[PDB]
Design an enzyme around this catalytic site. Structure first.
Site, PDB file in Angstrom:
ATOM      1  N   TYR A 264       0.856  -1.156  -0.115  1.00 32.53           N
ATOM      2  CA  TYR A 264       0.058  -0.119  -0.142  1.00 32.53           C
ATOM      3  C   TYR A 264       0.811   1.093   0.111  1.00 32.53           C
ATOM      4  O   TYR A 264       0.216   2.253   0.554  1.00 32.53           O
ATOM      5  CB  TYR A 264      -1.145  -0.104   1.133  1.00 32.53           C
ATOM      6  CG  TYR A 264      -2.235  -1.023   1.143  1.00 32.53           C
ATOM      7  CD1 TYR A 264      -2.940  -0.926  -0.289  1.00 32.53           C
ATOM      8  CD2 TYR A 264      -2.534  -1.751   2.241  1.00 32.53           C
ATOM      9  CE1 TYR A 264      -4.136  -1.867   0.043  1.00 32.53           C
ATOM     10  CE2 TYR A 264      -3.635  -2.672   1.871  1.00 32.53           C
ATOM     11  CZ  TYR A 264      -4.381  -2.614   0.945  1.00 32.53           C
ATOM     12  OH  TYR A 264      -5.567  -3.653   0.879  1.00 32.53           O
TER      13      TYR A 264
ATOM     14  N   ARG B 244     -12.136  -6.466 -10.824  1.00 32.03           N
ATOM     15  CA  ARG B 244     -12.532  -5.048 -10.153  1.00 32.03           C
ATOM     16  C   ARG B 244     -14.110  -4.736 -10.265  1.00 32.03           C
ATOM     17  O   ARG B 244     -14.870  -4.443  -9.318  1.00 32.03           O
ATOM     18  CB  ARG B 244     -12.037  -3.823 -10.658  1.00 32.03           C
ATOM     19  CG  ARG B 244     -10.500  -3.894 -10.361  1.00 32.03           C
ATOM     20  CD  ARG B 244      -9.849  -3.602  -9.044  1.00 32.03           C
ATOM     21  NE  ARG B 244     -10.182  -2.284  -8.940  1.00 32.03           N
ATOM     22  CZ  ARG B 244      -9.489  -1.555  -7.619  1.00 32.03           C
ATOM     23  NH1 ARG B 244      -8.649  -2.008  -6.869  1.00 32.03           N
ATOM     24  NH2 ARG B 244      -9.845  -0.253  -7.456  1.00 32.03           N
TER      25      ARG B 244
ATOM     26  N   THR C 252     -14.489   0.543  -4.259  1.00 37.08           N
ATOM     27  CA  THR C 252     -13.796   0.421  -3.009  1.00 37.08           C
ATOM     28  C   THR C 252     -14.634   0.648  -1.794  1.00 37.08           C
ATOM     29  O   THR C 252     -14.336  -0.281  -0.885  1.00 37.08           O
ATOM     30  CB  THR C 252     -12.713   1.697  -2.986  1.00 37.08           C
ATOM     31  OG1 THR C 252     -12.013   1.764  -4.333  1.00 37.08           O
ATOM     32  CG2 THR C 252     -11.623   1.615  -1.792  1.00 37.08           C
TER      33      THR C 252
ATOM     34  N   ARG D 267     -18.896  -6.829  -2.731  1.00 39.41           N
ATOM     35  CA  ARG D 267     -19.007  -5.855  -1.516  1.00 39.41           C
ATOM     36  C   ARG D 267     -20.243  -5.343  -1.396  1.00 39.41           C
ATOM     37  O   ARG D 267     -20.694  -5.325  -0.325  1.00 39.41           O
ATOM     38  CB  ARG D 267     -17.963  -4.740  -1.977  1.00 39.41           C
ATOM     39  CG  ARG D 267     -16.443  -4.696  -1.243  1.00 39.41           C
ATOM     40  CD  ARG D 267     -15.684  -3.742  -1.754  1.00 39.41           C
ATOM     41  NE  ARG D 267     -14.222  -4.168  -1.659  1.00 39.41           N
ATOM     42  CZ  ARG D 267     -13.324  -3.893  -2.442  1.00 39.41           C
ATOM     43  NH1 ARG D 267     -13.465  -2.821  -3.482  1.00 39.41           N
ATOM     44  NH2 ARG D 267     -12.112  -3.979  -2.175  1.00 39.41           N
TER      45      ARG D 267
ATOM     46  N   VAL E 174     -16.001   0.938   4.105  1.00 34.65           N
ATOM     47  CA  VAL E 174     -14.658   0.760   3.447  1.00 34.65           C
ATOM     48  C   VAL E 174     -13.482   0.185   4.229  1.00 34.65           C
ATOM     49  O   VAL E 174     -12.577  -0.655   3.426  1.00 34.65           O
ATOM     50  CB  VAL E 174     -14.379   2.249   2.905  1.00 34.65           C
ATOM     51  CG1 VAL E 174     -14.281   3.356   4.148  1.00 34.65           C
ATOM     52  CG2 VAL E 174     -13.328   2.120   1.654  1.00 34.65           C
TER      53      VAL E 174
ATOM     54  N   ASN F 161     -13.872  -3.907   3.691  1.00 39.01           N
ATOM     55  CA  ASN F 161     -14.221  -4.482   2.529  1.00 39.01           C
ATOM     56  C   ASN F 161     -13.405  -5.768   2.553  1.00 39.01           C
ATOM     57  O   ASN F 161     -12.433  -6.106   3.191  1.00 39.01           O
ATOM     58  CB  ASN F 161     -14.095  -3.576   1.295  1.00 39.01           C
ATOM     59  CG  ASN F 161     -12.619  -2.934   1.055  1.00 39.01           C
ATOM     60  OD1 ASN F 161     -12.365  -2.012   0.522  1.00 39.01           O
ATOM     61  ND2 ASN F 161     -11.737  -3.703   1.908  1.00 39.01           N
TER      62      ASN F 161
HETATM   63  N1  LIG Z   1     -11.274   6.074   3.955  1.00 34.95           N
HETATM   64  C1  LIG Z   1     -10.670   4.834   4.350  1.00 34.95           C
HETATM   65  N2  LIG Z   1     -10.914   4.585   5.790  1.00 34.95           N
HETATM   66  C2  LIG Z   1     -10.369   3.139   6.145  1.00 34.95           C
HETATM   67  N3  LIG Z   1      -9.834   2.248   5.064  1.00 34.95           N
HETATM   68  C3  LIG Z   1      -9.751   2.417   3.717  1.00 34.95           C
HETATM   69  C4  LIG Z   1     -10.002   3.909   3.189  1.00 34.95           C
HETATM   70  N4  LIG Z   1     -10.048   3.930   2.083  1.00 34.95           N
HETATM   71  C5  LIG Z   1      -9.493   2.922   1.669  1.00 34.95           C
HETATM   72  N5  LIG Z   1      -9.457   2.103   2.775  1.00 34.95           N
HETATM   73  C6  LIG Z   1      -8.889   0.643   2.582  1.00 34.95           C
HETATM   74  O1  LIG Z   1      -7.549   0.708   2.023  1.00 34.95           O
HETATM   75  C7  LIG Z   1      -7.639  -0.130   0.660  1.00 34.95           C
HETATM   76  C8  LIG Z   1      -6.922   0.364  -0.378  1.00 34.95           C
HETATM   77  O2  LIG Z   1      -7.504   1.623  -0.911  1.00 34.95           O
HETATM   78  P1  LIG Z   1      -7.464   2.053  -2.309  1.00 34.95           P
HETATM   79  O3  LIG Z   1      -6.142   1.777  -2.952  1.00 34.95           O
HETATM   80  O4  LIG Z   1      -8.002   3.552  -2.259  1.00 34.95           O
HETATM   81  O5  LIG Z   1      -8.698   1.227  -3.065  1.00 34.95           O
HETATM   82  P2  LIG Z   1      -8.833  -0.269  -3.482  1.00 34.95           P
HETATM   83  O6  LIG Z   1      -8.518  -1.259  -2.741  1.00 34.95           O
HETATM   84  O7  LIG Z   1     -10.161  -0.138  -4.267  1.00 34.95           O
HETATM   85  O8  LIG Z   1      -7.460  -0.039  -4.936  1.00 34.95           O
HETATM   86  C9  LIG Z   1      -9.295  -0.174   0.454  1.00 34.95           C
HETATM   87  O9  LIG Z   1      -9.751  -1.372  -0.225  1.00 34.95           O
HETATM   88  C10 LIG Z   1      -9.731  -0.420   1.907  1.00 34.95           C
HETATM   89  O10 LIG Z   1      -9.752  -1.699   2.519  1.00 34.95           O
END
Ligand SMILES: Nc1ncnc2c1ncn2[C@@H]1O[C@H](COP(=O)(O)OP(=O)(O)O)[C@@H](O)[C@H]1O
Ligand SMILES: Nc1ncnc2c1ncn2[C@@H]1O[C@H](COP(=O)(O)OP(=O)(O)O)[C@@H](O)[C@H]1O
Ligand SMILES: Nc1ncnc2c1ncn2[C@@H]1O[C@H](COP(=O)(O)OP(=O)(O)O)[C@@H](O)[C@H]1O
Ligand SMILES: Nc1ncnc2c1ncn2[C@@H]1O[C@H](COP(=O)(O)OP(=O)(O)O)[C@@H](O)[C@H]1O
Ligand SMILES: Nc1ncnc2c1ncn2[C@@H]1O[C@H](COP(=O)(O)OP(=O)(O)O)[C@@H](O)[C@H]1O
Ligand SMILES: Nc1ncnc2c1ncn2[C@@H]1O[C@H](COP(=O)(O)OP(=O)(O)O)[C@@H](O)[C@H]1O
Lengths: 152, 152, 152, 152, 152, 152
Positions: free
Chosen positions: D52, D88, D94, D105, D112, D115
């Site tokens: 991440y 996706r 998300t 989801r 969020v 998920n």
């Molecule tokens: N505002 C938030 N508060 C808490 N956890 C979050 C938030 N936004 C994202 N996350 C967590 O971080 C992961 C990574 O975020 P992101 O890269 O934006 O989305 P994705 O997983 O859809 O690629 C999300 O899948 C979710 O588990």
């Protein structure tokens, strides 16, 4: 006849009315059997009297023939190793009361006169019922791509 | 017309090979539609070419026609209010990529040249396709006990 | 408020009759909402016209009240973050023709007058409907072990 | 890369705890995608910080990394045409609140931060995450018997 | 010992090819068992020959060993009270013909040489098979939130 | 008597907590039994020791009463031919270790003290338990459209 054994199955009118056709078909698909004939049909009492000819002396014979003609049935032929015996195992006992949970009748039925489905009781009955319900050209041969993952 | 509208549906050869016939049938049953015709056929190229006549000049027409003739198909007629338009919604976009999860193509496949099912695109198309695939005496009229809980 | 927001849901007479109660309940359970009240009732017409008070002058109002009274309904209260708005998304558009597959009405229903479920349209409607269908003592508080895995 | 595209998917700790691993795997199997790597793992915060890395400036970054290390994840690689984009689509937005019924989801999640699952957002992220989580020898090539019924 | 008993399970190559991995995993999850190890491997004949050492002189040993090496297998360790004996019950008889509907082999296959899954036959066998298939650091200890509702 | 026989069933606290209420209900619905009473309750200890009166002198009696009181239970009444005996078959043996796959406890449970459901053991116990959990006005009479397809 090994893996080329065939059985006649029919979803009875109650199965159609309760919307359990797809549910029934799925059970035989997921098991690995090959569907080789399929037909939605309105069975005449003449065909049904012959289909159940062995039962002509029974007190419920008239009722059975009339119930089986009171609505469409889904007539089917399935193919595979011990398909007659094994289809009967999947159906469960004639009387739903003796059919355990897991079987069609154990999961879906209460009473012997409203069991959802017919299956040939033996290979001899299968051969008789296939010819009774289907013409030769209604029986399809197809090469199953996943056949190697079900046999040998 | 009305609750009496009919549509032609066909599980394509990939549906049979991937054991999704019961899965497909179950989804129209549970939606509330009436199954009025059903048969497993091995379609000729000639039938399929007439079936897809409007796509005669398409670059993929050959592939479509051969693929449809490559295995058994489950031919069906379903009946109900707005059944043509609604079945298409249940099926999803022509290209499974554009078909949302929840739809048949959305849940069950990847590519446009292998999208597991055909559905009539209009009442006029359904009328032509039913006559093309079925004899009139293969279309069954039956009193559905379920219409009471689906229609006002 | 927040994670403790509550909505009122009811399986309409066509839902019970089509044996879809378990199906409906399962969908809210698998989503992670908390069930805090549940009841099978024959709702009186007097209750139903106050429940649907806002639709008094609609042509269908009369036969909507009489229908909802014509059979058992499963009354329930669900709890979770944004439950009101999320329940309505899960249930689908009022007219099932506008309800996408994946939603309850999109999967199970054809016509507006036979859409197998009611759900509060707002937080304020929920407070009102919950109070109208249940006594304070019918709404249960219980420690939700699953909550630690559904919320941050 | 066509049908040979690959994506990295992971069932998050909440998915394991809620017993949704098989349920998740099934959705991707039934869609036609090929499972090519699978691993139950306890991800270190060091790997998760890198996984991440793009989110390192975000206020929830610490919480996210700690949650993802608080339990086992099911790390996976899936293969097929547009597998990144389409996975996706099957996951849904998300934020579960924006994910419609039909998606993982939309069907299974509320918030969020809980998920159930991770999917690569692009082919570049896929390539980065595959190498991050898996060694080359953990990626398996197999001839899918039903491949011809999914492609062409 | 006790709730800490472990068993070795493997989805065989037919399980992967017939897309039944999620289906198999879901059945142990919903039973209440804890998944403590998981990986997709392509087993060598050498591993499989050691795995089935006791069947060394059987007429079918060659076929078994080749079939198991023919495709990827999903290797698993599951944990819970009486998990070895109970998993075997869930799996069903060695010959799928003798395995009642409701069991994995009962629902999902036909023949003994293609029975979709392996399960340890005893605690002593499980102990040998776990060590054979997994490194000790592939076995995960995690606090399961679900044990509270499965154990007294 | 006959088709109008009734049993008492209750989803125990572990059933609600594991989100298996819909699952349980569905299984009795698909079987064709008629739901005539339904309710979510926090049953008092005073009620539970009279419910389990016959097990007074059992070592587990004390912690069985306290457990069943430690959370919400879904109380219900089902109606149909042989419902008492058939419900118990569907639920499975008291100890889930003796309960075959296909049954509720065989599919979902591990240990005797966490078997997610209660069912009356006899017709006489049913009369007694129904009367103890519900008022006369809570048991509903409704015209079962499905009955014409479940009974002769
Ligand atoms: N505002 C938030 N508060 C808490 N956890 C979050 C938030 N936004 C994202 N996350 C967590 O971080 C992961 C990574 O975020 P992101 O890269 O934006 O989305 P994705 O997983 O859809 O690629 C999300 O899948 C979710 O588990
Ligand atoms: N006692 C009965 N009363 C009413 N209907 C019956 C009775 N026994 C059998 N039937 C019906 O007749 C069908 C044929 O009976 P039978 O040949 O004995 O069983 P099976 O269908 O198991 O081969 C049954 O499947 C059932 O639908
Ligand atoms: N671009 C394409 N490439 C390959 N096959 C296609 C393509 N477009 C359509 N097909 C096949 O031809 C069928 C008929 O096309 P069309 O009538 O346009 O869609 P629909 O079946 O959704 O009405 C499609 O369902 C699909 O199987
Ligand atoms: N045009 C109509 N004809 C018949 N019944 C209707 C019509 N519109 C709405 N209804 C019924 O009234 C109920 C309440 O209406 P409304 O509040 O508009 O929808 P919703 O229940 O989705 O909030 C609906 O669930 C539906 O059964
Ligand atoms: N008679 C046979 N013919 C072919 N294959 C067999 C036969 N018996 C067993 N096998 C295969 O060998 C595996 C191991 O056999 P065994 O240990 O006896 O059964 P189980 O796996 O149920 O413990 C079986 O699961 C099956 O895949
Ligand atoms: N040995 C035991 N230890 C703990 N709890 C038990 C034991 N035996 C029975 N119980 C609990 O008491 C309940 C009622 O017991 P019993 O009437 O024997 O079984 P059933 O509920 O299947 O009729 C069971 O559902 C079970 O939860």
């Amino acid at each position: 006849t090994g893996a080329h054994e065939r059985t006649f199955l029919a979803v009875k009118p109650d199965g159609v009315q309760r919307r359990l056709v797809g549910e029934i078909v799925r059970r035989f698909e997921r098991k690995g059997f090959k569907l080789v004939a399929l037909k939605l049909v309105q069975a005449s009492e003449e065909l049904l009297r012959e289909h159940y000819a062995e039962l002509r002396e029974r007190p419920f014979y008239g009722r059975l023939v009339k119930y089986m003609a009171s609505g469409p049935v889904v007539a089917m032929v399935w193919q595979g190793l011990d398909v007659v015996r094994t289809s009967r195992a999947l159906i469960g006992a004639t009387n739903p009361a003796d059919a355990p949970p897991g079987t069609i009748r154990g999961d879906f039925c209460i009473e012997v006169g409203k069991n959802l489905i017919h299956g040939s009781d033996s290979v001899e009955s299968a051969r008789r019922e296939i010819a009774l319900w289907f013409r030769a050209d209604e029986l399809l041969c197809w090469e199953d791509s996943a056949g190697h993952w079900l046999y040998e």
